[PDB]
Design an enzyme around this catalytic site. Structure first.
Site, PDB file in Angstrom:
ATOM      1  N   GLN A   1      27.901 -39.140 -23.289  1.00  0.00           N
ATOM      2  CA  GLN A   1      26.903 -40.200 -23.588  1.00  0.00           C
ATOM      3  C   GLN A   1      25.485 -39.643 -23.807  1.00  0.00           C
ATOM      4  O   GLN A   1      24.736 -40.145 -24.636  1.00  0.00           O
ATOM      5  CB  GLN A   1      26.884 -41.261 -22.464  1.00  0.00           C
ATOM      6  CG  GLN A   1      26.184 -42.582 -22.855  1.00  0.00           C
ATOM      7  CD  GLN A   1      25.910 -43.538 -21.699  1.00  0.00           C
ATOM      8  OE1 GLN A   1      25.806 -43.137 -20.549  1.00  0.00           O
ATOM      9  NE2 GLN A   1      25.773 -44.815 -22.020  1.00  0.00           N
TER      10      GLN A   1
ATOM     11  N   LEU B   1      34.259 -43.763 -34.041  1.00  0.00           N
ATOM     12  CA  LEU B   1      35.311 -43.129 -33.238  1.00  0.00           C
ATOM     13  C   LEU B   1      34.850 -42.590 -31.873  1.00  0.00           C
ATOM     14  O   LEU B   1      35.689 -42.263 -31.032  1.00  0.00           O
ATOM     15  CB  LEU B   1      36.032 -42.027 -34.043  1.00  0.00           C
ATOM     16  CG  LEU B   1      35.402 -40.647 -34.259  1.00  0.00           C
ATOM     17  CD1 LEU B   1      35.353 -39.822 -32.987  1.00  0.00           C
ATOM     18  CD2 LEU B   1      36.192 -39.914 -35.306  1.00  0.00           C
TER      19      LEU B   1
ATOM     20  N   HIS C   1      23.876 -39.557 -27.943  1.00  0.00           N
ATOM     21  CA  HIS C   1      22.805 -40.544 -28.142  1.00  0.00           C
ATOM     22  C   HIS C   1      21.482 -39.968 -28.708  1.00  0.00           C
ATOM     23  O   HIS C   1      20.485 -40.678 -28.798  1.00  0.00           O
ATOM     24  CB  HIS C   1      22.568 -41.331 -26.841  1.00  0.00           C
ATOM     25  CG  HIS C   1      23.555 -42.439 -26.615  1.00  0.00           C
ATOM     26  ND1 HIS C   1      24.916 -42.258 -26.729  1.00  0.00           N
ATOM     27  CD2 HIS C   1      23.375 -43.740 -26.288  1.00  0.00           C
ATOM     28  CE1 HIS C   1      25.532 -43.401 -26.486  1.00  0.00           C
ATOM     29  NE2 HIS C   1      24.619 -44.316 -26.211  1.00  0.00           N
TER      30      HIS C   1
HETATM   31  C1  HEM Z   1      27.265 -47.671 -18.153  1.00  0.00           C
HETATM   32  C2  HEM Z   1      27.274 -46.845 -19.210  1.00  0.00           C
HETATM   33  C3  HEM Z   1      27.425 -47.403 -20.641  1.00  0.00           C
HETATM   34  C4  HEM Z   1      26.988 -48.591 -21.060  1.00  0.00           C
HETATM   35  C5  HEM Z   1      26.247 -49.643 -20.207  1.00  0.00           C
HETATM   36  C6  HEM Z   1      27.328 -48.724 -22.462  1.00  0.00           C
HETATM   37  C7  HEM Z   1      27.060 -49.797 -23.278  1.00  0.00           C
HETATM   38  C8  HEM Z   1      26.776 -49.685 -24.617  1.00  0.00           C
HETATM   39  C9  HEM Z   1      26.199 -50.701 -25.479  1.00  0.00           C
HETATM   40  C10 HEM Z   1      25.804 -52.125 -25.057  1.00  0.00           C
HETATM   41  C11 HEM Z   1      26.072 -50.185 -26.700  1.00  0.00           C
HETATM   42  C12 HEM Z   1      25.511 -50.935 -27.935  1.00  0.00           C
HETATM   43  C13 HEM Z   1      26.676 -51.437 -28.804  1.00  0.00           C
HETATM   44  C14 HEM Z   1      26.306 -52.599 -29.699  1.00  0.00           C
HETATM   45  O1  HEM Z   1      25.249 -53.233 -29.440  1.00  0.00           O
HETATM   46  O2  HEM Z   1      27.067 -52.909 -30.668  1.00  0.00           O
HETATM   47  C15 HEM Z   1      26.576 -48.816 -26.648  1.00  0.00           C
HETATM   48  C16 HEM Z   1      26.636 -47.919 -27.688  1.00  0.00           C
HETATM   49  C17 HEM Z   1      27.378 -46.757 -27.746  1.00  0.00           C
HETATM   50  N1  HEM Z   1      28.037 -46.128 -26.699  1.00  0.00           N
HETATM   51 FE1  HEM Z   1      27.977 -46.863 -24.777  1.00  0.00          FE
HETATM   52  N2  HEM Z   1      27.983 -47.574 -22.857  1.00  0.00           N
HETATM   53  C18 HEM Z   1      28.066 -46.734 -21.756  1.00  0.00           C
HETATM   54  C19 HEM Z   1      28.656 -45.484 -21.736  1.00  0.00           C
HETATM   55  C20 HEM Z   1      29.090 -44.766 -22.836  1.00  0.00           C
HETATM   56  C21 HEM Z   1      29.859 -43.538 -22.817  1.00  0.00           C
HETATM   57  C22 HEM Z   1      30.361 -42.777 -21.574  1.00  0.00           C
HETATM   58  C23 HEM Z   1      30.074 -43.158 -24.073  1.00  0.00           C
HETATM   59  C24 HEM Z   1      30.870 -41.899 -24.483  1.00  0.00           C
HETATM   60  C25 HEM Z   1      30.269 -40.884 -25.102  1.00  0.00           C
HETATM   61  C26 HEM Z   1      29.449 -44.128 -24.952  1.00  0.00           C
HETATM   62  C27 HEM Z   1      29.438 -44.115 -26.331  1.00  0.00           C
HETATM   63  C28 HEM Z   1      28.693 -44.969 -27.129  1.00  0.00           C
HETATM   64  C29 HEM Z   1      28.450 -44.806 -28.553  1.00  0.00           C
HETATM   65  C30 HEM Z   1      28.939 -43.701 -29.510  1.00  0.00           C
HETATM   66  C31 HEM Z   1      27.591 -45.997 -28.946  1.00  0.00           C
HETATM   67  C32 HEM Z   1      27.033 -46.304 -30.343  1.00  0.00           C
HETATM   68  C33 HEM Z   1      25.647 -45.667 -30.417  1.00  0.00           C
HETATM   69  C34 HEM Z   1      24.882 -46.234 -31.574  1.00  0.00           C
HETATM   70  O3  HEM Z   1      25.466 -46.378 -32.682  1.00  0.00           O
HETATM   71  O4  HEM Z   1      23.682 -46.542 -31.377  1.00  0.00           O
HETATM   72  N3  HEM Z   1      28.873 -45.102 -24.158  1.00  0.00           N
HETATM   73  N4  HEM Z   1      27.008 -48.549 -25.369  1.00  0.00           N
HETATM   74  C1  LIG Z   2      40.497 -28.976 -33.102  1.00  0.00           C
HETATM   75  C2  LIG Z   2      39.925 -28.796 -31.727  1.00  0.00           C
HETATM   76  C3  LIG Z   2      39.760 -27.325 -31.421  1.00  0.00           C
HETATM   77  C4  LIG Z   2      40.962 -29.333 -30.764  1.00  0.00           C
HETATM   78  C5  LIG Z   2      38.585 -29.503 -31.621  1.00  0.00           C
HETATM   79  C6  LIG Z   2      38.459 -30.591 -30.778  1.00  0.00           C
HETATM   80  C7  LIG Z   2      37.265 -31.265 -30.641  1.00  0.00           C
HETATM   81  C8  LIG Z   2      36.156 -30.864 -31.355  1.00  0.00           C
HETATM   82  C9  LIG Z   2      36.255 -29.780 -32.202  1.00  0.00           C
HETATM   83  C10 LIG Z   2      37.456 -29.113 -32.334  1.00  0.00           C
HETATM   84 CL1  LIG Z   2      37.475 -27.777 -33.428  1.00  0.00          CL
HETATM   85  C11 LIG Z   2      34.903 -31.574 -31.176  1.00  0.00           C
HETATM   86  C12 LIG Z   2      34.966 -32.727 -30.511  1.00  0.00           C
HETATM   87  C13 LIG Z   2      33.635 -33.414 -30.287  1.00  0.00           C
HETATM   88  O1  LIG Z   2      32.652 -32.974 -30.936  1.00  0.00           O
HETATM   89  O2  LIG Z   2      33.656 -34.348 -29.439  1.00  0.00           O
HETATM   90  C14 LIG Z   2      36.238 -33.332 -30.019  1.00  0.00           C
HETATM   91  C15 LIG Z   2      36.709 -34.445 -30.957  1.00  0.00           C
HETATM   92  F1  LIG Z   2      37.813 -35.106 -30.528  1.00  0.00           F
HETATM   93  F2  LIG Z   2      36.971 -33.961 -32.202  1.00  0.00           F
HETATM   94  F3  LIG Z   2      35.783 -35.436 -31.053  1.00  0.00           F
HETATM   95  O3  LIG Z   2      37.250 -32.340 -29.757  1.00  0.00           O
END
Ligand code: HEM
Ligand SMILES: CC(C)(C)c1cc2c(cc1Cl)C=C(C(=O)O)[C@@H](C(F)(F)F)O2
Ligand code: HEM
Ligand SMILES: *[C@@H]1O[C@H](CO)[C@@H](O[C@@H]2O[C@H](CO)[C@@H](O[C@@H]3O[C@H](CO)[C@@H](O)[C@H](O)[C@H]3NC(C)=O)[C@H](O)[C@H]2NC(C)=O)[C@H](O)[C@H]1NC(C)=O
Ligand SMILES: *[C@@H]1O[C@H](CO)[C@@H](O[C@@H]2O[C@H](CO)[C@@H](O[C@@H]3O[C@H](CO)[C@@H](O)[C@H](O)[C@H]3NC(C)=O)[C@H](O)[C@H]2NC(C)=O)[C@H](O)[C@H]1NC(C)=O
Ligand SMILES: CC(C)(C)c1cc2c(cc1Cl)C=C(C(=O)O)[C@@H](C(F)(F)F)O2
Ligand SMILES: CCCCCCCCO[C@@H]1O[C@H](CO)[C@@H](O)[C@H](O)[C@H]1O
Ligand SMILES: *[C@@H]1O[C@H](CO)[C@@H](O)[C@H](O)[C@H]1NC(C)=O
Ligand SMILES: *[C@@H]1O[C@H](CO)[C@@H](O)[C@H](O)[C@H]1NC(C)=O
Ligand SMILES: *[C@H]1O[C@H](CO)[C@@H](O)[C@H](O)[C@H]1NC(C)=O
Ligand SMILES: *[C@H]1O[C@H](CO)[C@@H](O)[C@H](O)[C@H]1NC(C)=O
Lengths: 552, 552
Positions: free
Chosen positions: A172, A353, A176
């Site tokens: 996270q 994703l 971000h």
């Molecule tokens: C308590 C912790 C967390 C809260 C409260 C939370 C909640 C949220 C909310 C409300 C949004 C906005 C989505 C929308 O308005 O459509 C968001 C975005 C997102 N979250 Fe979380 N989430 C949490 C943890 C995580 C974790 C662990 C990940 C994994 C990496 C994650 C990945 C994402 C991603 C990729 C976005 C979209 C970012 C963007 O496009 O701005 N989040 N989250």
């Molecule tokens: C193909 C292999 C070696 C397993 C691989 C796995 C990965 C990543 C890169 C490689 Cl080369 C990068 C990742 C990330 O940036 O979160 C994650 C992904 F699931 F892709 F999102 O795991």
């Protein structure tokens, strides 16, 4: 009545309309000819027979621990193997970039405008009879129903790869900086104009913000001492806009690079560790260069931490995910004799994703407490109470949840997972099978093939009818996992090619940057080339606690 | 203070400071080693024994016409030779970019901030005792003094390669899309954020302006008809911002991409020609694609015109400078099996070196009229009185001035020449010889060797005292020209690598972009692949007049 709605062209060829009801595929360079680019050239047939599958390559890399140990201790072979992981995937991404939410054909607008996320596959045209194209019902199934039937959590499912809260909050945190959707403009637009790993989450996007957070002595960032412990400064001191609700007191409104990091204490934990690391690197460079001033002490320190971030992401984070017995390596030299474009643009599909919300637990367990979401969120009082040390011990223990496998999304956050589905459709995402073909994968011929079971497969049939109509975001969270793995096949094979371009396409991996003087001499270059998640913690947290991205 | 002021590190080695009075050179991937990167490696010695000088190569492409006559007609060979001119150049430019006017070390701020021009060599530091680092006097010679003595025109000198006013105004017009200095910020900053061949001078920098310029029907640009001749539209109608003096009446305030083009009637010629072209390309694309709408028409046309610009630039404009008997090719497939980064950043030194105001004649000659600067500038009625046809015929006949060889800047524009001097010093440019070294040329050993004569050499030695203190820009316009040539060695060998990066690094020349379907079909691709200055005029100027970049 656009004759390209059915996605006729195949093996990456392109559909152009040549009249009100006629189309034509451009097969150039695709290694296939014929009307829909389905007839192979002679060379391309041999290539296919000899090439293995993603699931077979996965078997090898996750078995034969004894052979991989030999390989891991011969520097020369290790490099050759890693070169192959890098090169074998570059061709899967388009660079220079191509499409976006508003453009299904290459245009100058789609290339030039850095406010869009780019797109791996173009959007279904607005004049197409069905949402996917010419397949499926007039409207997709109800998203609330997909949320409730196959996504929401009944009983908590833990990651059988032993992931933990240090890993989830680090996921996270890292992401971000580049994923920052501008909800005013829409789901397909972005506020991270650096597209990649520029560390804006510590230093700020604009120059204006950056200066407010700097001390202007010895290259450092502003800070304050509480309980004899270094923490980020206040909003009342610095003037940096943060998103807090009004019932937070002035003395608890912390100021950092990313305006949204005040709303979770896990975000604000890394926040403080990375800040401390900067000021620690300032002290190291200062001794090496008492002739240097404030700017060069700062600008060099930022380069070093961009080096550290990339290093850890490849050798601890992705290493942990991968499963492999082979040891991955961050070493930009492997690409100097290859055809690599040092450049990047964030794909919408990479953002979609990476919504790994099934990682989060029902409660947050620090020392002797079990905090609920309502108690945990917005509440930095907790941080000061316990301290950085206690947080690390406690989160290294607590186990995170399984992403793939279905039915493990926390009810606290049901709103968010529903938004993921809705905004996909709004951005006109093509189907799962068209997305698996785009990344050279065999299309799933059934819902039972997808989930590897009968109950959710049976539900998903009733709701979607044709497997060729199944959608990408939901498929990813329901997909059959690899053996004892956190993820399925589609997540990894799409995820990785996106990730590698944003890591290696960073200009500090470019030949003219990747040399010791770039980072203040050999002393600097070594910080990058020996950095790890365990040293990041030890150098910057009192008492040097043990840590890892897995439970013990 | 700074112990890198004297520019010790040779062969592109980077200087670092390891304490108050002690330096170190980073020789990574140079080919050399030792304290100052001067001791050669074995293969480096070998390569320097086989590589011919730039003057040797020039002589060979400009003699042996019977041998180049055959090479041209046999396409297999032609391609091998072009691929040599293309690839021999590439090692010279930093891509990703590195330095700028404020940063003499590498920094995120220098890489990230698109508002600066980039820098091929770093600035001279501020706390160095002299302007060139250590050599010369406390301060350089008086720029007035320099200007009057070797730069100003006494008597007009015609270009021996026959260059005419079509070429003069194509140069100004074409390059003023990416040389657009931001004079409120200072000379090291730009308003041209495409750092390349995006054609903002026809369509605008921002989506705001472009929309104001468009017809929104058949993909076309707005226009008006004055006496049966199609010209660009008014400011009243468009609301687009231009820079006219107060007395210009409402009906002569034309609206075009680049806001400054109204000031010069020759620029307005080309702006009207390319506008007629754009719309011409739209009509063709509708006979082909009667399904298509306004966006796709406007956007594919704008992609096609980019390719025509590049095509004409290489095969007419640069071909004409070269003086070569061998015929250059514009072919992106020559780089598909090479390593080449598809990006660019405009550089200050490119901006400075392209101030070719010696092209300008004493008066602008049309039909039986010789208009002075005073009469010619700001006055578009002249263009309406004679018309496009007659502007072209007159400008095909009128020879422009020689740039190199000294004493040919016309008096009217002397303040421009001085400013070119003073702004360079303002931006802490290094010496001429430091720049010649940087582009693998031989440093000059005396002022007489540089000029090829005696008189200017004596006056320049009197002012500067030491060859090693000579400045870049005045050097360019003093240099001994190639045999009957318009330029000398330095101008070309710096110029060509910067430019090929802006031509060939265009996103339209990559693999994924360069194929028929990007340009709306085989018909559309033909319009790029058979483009020329002759056809541009023929199809868009009444009576298809004959044209060329040199007087008969
Ligand atoms: C308590 C912790 C967390 C809260 C409260 C939370 C909640 C949220 C909310 C409300 C949004 C906005 C989505 C929308 O308005 O459509 C968001 C975005 C997102 N979250 Fe979380 N989430 C949490 C943890 C995580 C974790 C662990 C990940 C994994 C990496 C994650 C990945 C994402 C991603 C990729 C976005 C979209 C970012 C963007 O496009 O701005 N989040 N989250
Ligand atoms: C193909 C292999 C070696 C397993 C691989 C796995 C990965 C990543 C890169 C490689 Cl080369 C990068 C990742 C990330 O940036 O979160 C994650 C992904 F699931 F892709 F999102 O795991
Ligand atoms: C004949 C009419 C010309 C006049 C009156 C003129 C004069 C000037 C002036 C006043 C400036 C600085 C102010 C401005 O941006 O408007 C300038 C800059 C410049 N001139 Fe010209 N010039 C002329 C033609 C040319 C030609 C034929 C060339 C050949 C290429 C040329 C190349 C340049 C360049 C590259 C700059 C710097 C522009 C920038 O960085 O924004 N000019 N000239
Ligand atoms: C990258 O693409 C974006 C989407 O096209 C551009 O953002 C859009 O800029 C437009 C103006 O330049 C806005 O258009 C609206 O137009 C009407 C009619 O003139 C105005 O009255 C409105 O005020 C104006 N804006 C709004 C919010 O109504 C678009 O709204 C705006 N954003 C979106 C999401 O559509 C970017 O400008 C573009 N980048 C560049 C460099 O041009
Ligand atoms: C890319 O580089 C440029 C140079 O750093 C930036 O342009 C500068 O932006 C500054 C805004 O922070 C301006 O600051 C002025 O100076 C003081 C400094 O303390 C500010 O308080 C003032 O508010 C501001 N204005 C005045 C009138 O004093 C710089 O003046 C400004 N221009 C120049 C020529 O340096 C760009 O902002 C920058 N862009 C990004 C995204 O980093
Ligand atoms: C080496 C060769 C073929 C003579 C050559 C000459 C050129 C250019 C490119 C090449 Cl490859 C581009 C130019 C431009 O953009 O104006 C000019 C230049 F003088 F360099 F500025 O002439
Ligand atoms: C037309 C611009 C010249 C007026 C400014 C006076 C510059 C004097 O400069 C002199 O000019 C002489 C005649 O050209 C040269 O022979 C001398 O070498 C030169 O020093
Ligand atoms: C915030 O944390 C404090 C300190 O543990 C706790 O006492 C309090 O109940 C929490 N506040 C809210 C609103 O949940
Ligand atoms: C411009 O030139 C025209 C001739 O074409 C002449 O009539 C007029 O006086 C000139 N305009 C100005 C403003 O000097
Ligand atoms: C492509 O394949 C054949 C022509 O070879 C044709 O029968 C088929 O209809 C074509 N495309 C589609 C989408 O069916
Ligand atoms: C580099 O050259 C030699 C070391 O071989 C040394 O004598 C000299 O002073 C060095 N510095 C400069 C500016 O040449």
């Amino acid at each position: 009545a656009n004759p390209c709605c059915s996605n006729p062209c195949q093996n990456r060829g392109e559909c152009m309309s040549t009249g009100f009801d006629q189309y034509k595929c451009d097969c150039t360079r695709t290694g296939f000819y014929g009307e829909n680019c389905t007839t192979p050239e002679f060379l391309t047939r041999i290539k296919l027979l000899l090439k293995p599958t993603p699931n077979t390559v996965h078997y090898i890399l996750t078995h034969f621990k004894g052979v991989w140990n030999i390989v891991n201790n011969i520097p020369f072979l290790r490099s050759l193997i890693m070169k192959y992981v890098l090169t074998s995937r570059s061709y899967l991404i388009d660079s220079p970039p191509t499409y976006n939410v508003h453009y299904g054909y290459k245009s100058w607008e789609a290339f030039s405008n850095l406010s869009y996320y780019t797109r791996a596959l173009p959007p279904v045209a607005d004049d197409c009879p069905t949402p996917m194209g010419v397949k499926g019902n007039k409207e997709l199934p109800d998203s609330k129903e997909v949320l409730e039937k196959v996504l929401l959590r009944r009983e908590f499912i833990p990651d059988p790869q032993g992931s933990n809260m240090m890993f989830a909050f680090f996921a996270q945190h890292f992401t971000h900086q580049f994923f920052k959707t501008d909800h005013k403009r829409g789901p397909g637009f972005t506020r991270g104009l650096g597209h990649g790993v520029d560390l804006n989450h510590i230093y700020g996007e604009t120059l204006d913000r950056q200066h407010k957070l700097r001390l202007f002595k010895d290259g450092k960032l502003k800070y304050q001492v509480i309980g004899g412990e270094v923490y980020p400064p206040t909003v009342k001191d610095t003037q940096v806009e943060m998103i807090y609700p009004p019932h937070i007191p002035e003395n608890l409104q912390f100021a950092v690079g990313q305006e949204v990091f005040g709303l979770v204490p896990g975000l604000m934990m890394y926040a403080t560790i990375w800040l401390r690391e900067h000021n620690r690197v300032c002290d190291i460079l200062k001794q090496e260069h008492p002739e240097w001033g404030d700017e060069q002490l700062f600008q060099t320190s930022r380069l070093i931490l961009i080096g550290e971030t990339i290093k850890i992401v490849i050798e601890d984070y992705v290493q942990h995910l991968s499963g492999y017995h082979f040891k991955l390596k961050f070493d930009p030299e492997l690409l100097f004799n290859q055809q690599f474009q040092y450049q990047n643009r964030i794909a919408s599909e990479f953002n979609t994703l990476y919504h790994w919300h099934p990682l989060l637990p029902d409660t947050f367990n620090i020392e002797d407490q079990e905090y609920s979401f309502k108690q945990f969120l917005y509440n930095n009082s907790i941080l000061l109470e316990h301290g950085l040390t206690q947080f690390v011990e406690s989160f290294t223990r607590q186990i995170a949840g399984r992403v793939a496998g279905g039915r493990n999304v926390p009810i606290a956050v049901q709103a968010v997972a529903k938004a993921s589905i809705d905004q996909s459709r709004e951005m006109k995402y093509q189907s799962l099978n068209e997305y698996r073909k785009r990344f050279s994968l065999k299309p799933y011929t059934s819902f039972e093939e997808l989930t590897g079971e009968k109950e959710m497969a049976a539900e998903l049939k009733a709701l979607y009818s044709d497997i060729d109509v199944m959608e990408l975001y939901p498929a990813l969270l329901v997909e059959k996992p690899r053996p004892d793995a956190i993820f399925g096949e589609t997540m990894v094979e799409l995820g990785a090619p996106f990730s590698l371009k944003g890591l290696m396409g960073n200009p500090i991996c470019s030949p003219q940057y990747w040399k010791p003087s770039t980072f203040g001499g050999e002393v600097g270059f070594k910080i990058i080339n020996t950095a790890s998640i365990q040293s990041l913690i030890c150098n910057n947290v009192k008492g040097c606690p043990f840590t890892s991205f897995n439970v013990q």
